Amino acid sequence: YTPKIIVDYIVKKTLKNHDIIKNPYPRILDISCGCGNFLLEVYDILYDLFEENIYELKKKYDENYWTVDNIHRHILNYCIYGADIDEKAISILKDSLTNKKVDESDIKINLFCCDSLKKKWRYKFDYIVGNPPYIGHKKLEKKYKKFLLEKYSEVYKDKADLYFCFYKKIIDILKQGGIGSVITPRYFLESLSGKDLREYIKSNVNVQEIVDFLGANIFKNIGVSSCILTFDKKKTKETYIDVFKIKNEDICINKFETLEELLKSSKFEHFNINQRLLSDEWILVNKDDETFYNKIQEKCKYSLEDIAISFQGIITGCDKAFILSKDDVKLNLVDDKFLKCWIKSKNINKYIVDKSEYRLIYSNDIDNENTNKRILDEIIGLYKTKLENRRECKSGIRKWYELQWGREKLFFERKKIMYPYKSNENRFAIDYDNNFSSADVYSFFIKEEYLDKFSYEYLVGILNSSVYDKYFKITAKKMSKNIYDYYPNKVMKIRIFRDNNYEEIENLSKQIISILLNKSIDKGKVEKLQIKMDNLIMDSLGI
DNA sequence: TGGGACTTTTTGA
DNA sequence: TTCAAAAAGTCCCA
Numbered sequence: 075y076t077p078k079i080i081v082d083y084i085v086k087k088t089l090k091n092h093d094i095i096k097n098p099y100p101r102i103l104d105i106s107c108g109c110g111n112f113l114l115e116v117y118d119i120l121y122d123l124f125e126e127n128i129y130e131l132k133k134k135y136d137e138n139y140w141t142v143d144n145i146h147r148h149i150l151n152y153c154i155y156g157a158d159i160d161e162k163a164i165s166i167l168k169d170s171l172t173n174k175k176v177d178e179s180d181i182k183i184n185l186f187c188c189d190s191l192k193k194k195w196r197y198k199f200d201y202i203v204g205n206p207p208y209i210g211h212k213k214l215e216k217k218y219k220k221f222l223l224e225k226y227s228e229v230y231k232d233k234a235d236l237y238f239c240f241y242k243k244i245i246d247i248l249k250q251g252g253i254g255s256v257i258t259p260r261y262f263l264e265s266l267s268g269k270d271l272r273e274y275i276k277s278n279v280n281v282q283e284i285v286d287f288l289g290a291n292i293f294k295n296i297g298v299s300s301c302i303l304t305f306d307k308k309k310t311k312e313t314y315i316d317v318f319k320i321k322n323e324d325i326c327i328n329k330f331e332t333l334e335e336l337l338k339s340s341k342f343e344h345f346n347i348n349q350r351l352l353s354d355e356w357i358l359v360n361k362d363d364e365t366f367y368n369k370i371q372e373k374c375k376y377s378l379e380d381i382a383i384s385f386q387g388i389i390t391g392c393d394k395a396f397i398l399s400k401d402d403v404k405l406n407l408v409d410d411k412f413l414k415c416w417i418k419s420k421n422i423n424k425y426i427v428d429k430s431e432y433r434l435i436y437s438n439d440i441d442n443e444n445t446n447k448r449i450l451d452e453i454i455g456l457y458k459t460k461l462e463n464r465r466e467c468k469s470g471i472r473k474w475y476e477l478q479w480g481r482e483k484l485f486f487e488r489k490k491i492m493y494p495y496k497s498n499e500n501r502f503a504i505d506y507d508n509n510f511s512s513a514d515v516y517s518f519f520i521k522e523e524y525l526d527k528f529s530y531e532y533l534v535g536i537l538n539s540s541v542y543d544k545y546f547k548i549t550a551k552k553m554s555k556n557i558y559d560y561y562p563n564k565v566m567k568i569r570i571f572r573d574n575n576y577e578e579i580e581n582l583s584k585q586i587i588s589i590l591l592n593k594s595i596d597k598g599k600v601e602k603l604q605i606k607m608d609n610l611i612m613d614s615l616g617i
Numbered sequence: 618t619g620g621g622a623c624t625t626t627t628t629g630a
Numbered sequence: 631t632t633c634a635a636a637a638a639g640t641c642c643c644a
């Protein structure tokens with residue numbers, strides 16, 4: 075169930091400026107009403123609007139039809155439309171709507187118990203509101219997913235979520251000049267799976283306002299990051315979008331009387347976006363952050379993709395069969411040529427990597443089972459059956475004892491830069507011990523021809539600075555509260571520079587690394603050094 | 618006595 | 631053949 079404040083906000087957002095005199099026959103649709111949270115509020119608003127202008131309607135239109143007693147019949151016969159796939163919810167909503175008046179004649183309530191995606195809608199609607207389903211994300215049957223692919227190929231493709239299709243339907247059955255307002259998961263704004271949906275929305279309807287709650291738990295005891303979308307098909311010219319992005323992601327929804335109070339408060343920030351200038355990723359930032367990003371973009375000649383080679387870590391397919399504690403006695407059974415140092419994301423800090431506490435048995439270098447039978451029977455064979463269920467093992471590409479994705483050793487066994495894929499801040503570290511890692515850590519190394527221009531020390535100096543932390547967080551995807559996704563498709567697009575401040579920045583980075591490396595270390599001075607480096611970086615970027 | 622925070626490996630391309 | 635994106639379940643403290 076949607077929170078009541080959100081429902082009231084959406085309903086008012088649509089119907090507040092409706093001219094009931096000009097069009098006393100509005101069609102308002104709840105595609106997924108459930109118990110009818112939106113439709114009851116729509117009924118109340120419509121009843122108040124009609125009673126407020128009942129005598130004007132009587133004077134202009136038929137004098138007998140427009141009476142206060144007839145408002146209930148008119149609303150239930152011509153105005154409210156609801157759809158659902160649950161018959162019990164439909165019956166409950168019908169009973170509530172009938173009891174809103176409190177049997178002389180028959181009142182036909184326009185309620186449909188059907189699949190909204192597969193229904194042949196007879197007419198479009200002036201207003202559409204509600205909350206599309208999200209409980210069923212990947213639980214669709216094979217036939218249903220095939221139908222979605224065949225009939226909704228423009229917004230739904232493989233990894234797309236169900237509610238994407240709903241968006242298309244809401245756009246398709248919206249009357250020209252009508253208004254739609256829904257609360258949905260916010261993931262389609264930034265996820266690569268929703269590029270088709272974003273383009274479909276941008277090229278058809280005018281978006282008016284986006285409420286981005288980010289990681290705030292809008293739905294109690296439900297872990298979905300929600301957003302509110304309002305749009306119209308009116309003949310606007312400029313079509314600027316109000317954006318209300320939350321600031322404090324730990325606020326409580328119930329602690330406010332209305333959503334307007336929360337939006338106008340300091341817990342939210344507002345800025346305008348030109349819809350014509352939207353990219354595919356829908357970067358939504360204020361003017362100051364936009365100027366910061368543009369300055370950094372124009373100042374930097376190179377990007378990480380231009381001067382570096384990036385790769386994902388080892389994917390064994392069964393970590394228990396190949397990862398052991400360095401203290402484990404079974405490592406005495408494995409030749410040290412097959413053992414590689416193994417690190418996790420927690421082992422990666424700024425500028426350096428913690429000492430590896432684990433060893434990976436790089437079984438791809440085991441040639442035959444006869445010579446190393448002890449390794450294959452006493453260590454790796456413990457999970458042989460599970461290792462046999464891997465896709466490449468079943469297809470015959472990889473042997474049962476080999477790593478599913480062992481990548482290339484020579485990529486890992488070199489001086490490189492490693493970073494976690496999900497972190498609250500920029501943590502880029504120079505690896506000095508040829509560490510191997512799982513997919514939770516990404517790595518990259520400088521290209522050979524750019525080694526004279528860029529050094530690992532300078533790269534980790536600029537990347538770990540607060541300047542580049544802000545620069546990356548501007549465009550980075552926020553997967554959860556206080557957690558950003560650090561993936562190559564975003565990390566490698568970071569732009570880097572080099573100028574007269576290069577040598578001093580590199581020296582400061584070297585000092586920080588040297589302090590962090592020694593045993594008798596106090597963090598201390600490092601912070602001071604960092605501050606100085608940041609100054610230079612700002613001096614280099616004109617910020 | 619509830620209540621959400623995290624890392625391994627599946628899989629499309 | 632192999633990359634990399636994203637999907638996917640258990641568990642402990644006040």
Ligand SMILES: Cc1cc(Nc2cc(C[NH+](C)C)cc(NC(=O)c3cccc(Nc4ccnc5ccccc45)c3)c2)nc(N)n1
Nearest residue numbers: 496553554620621622623624625637638639640641642643
């Ligand atoms: C908070 C808390 C907690 C606990 N515990 C535990 C914990 C953990 C970790 N850390 C510490 C937190 C874990 C556990 N398990 C299991 O199985 C595991 C293991 C490993 C890994 C994993 N991963 C996964 C899976 C699936 N899916 C997903 C999704 C997203 C992400 C991730 C993921 C899991 C338990 N307890 C309480 N009380 N609380």
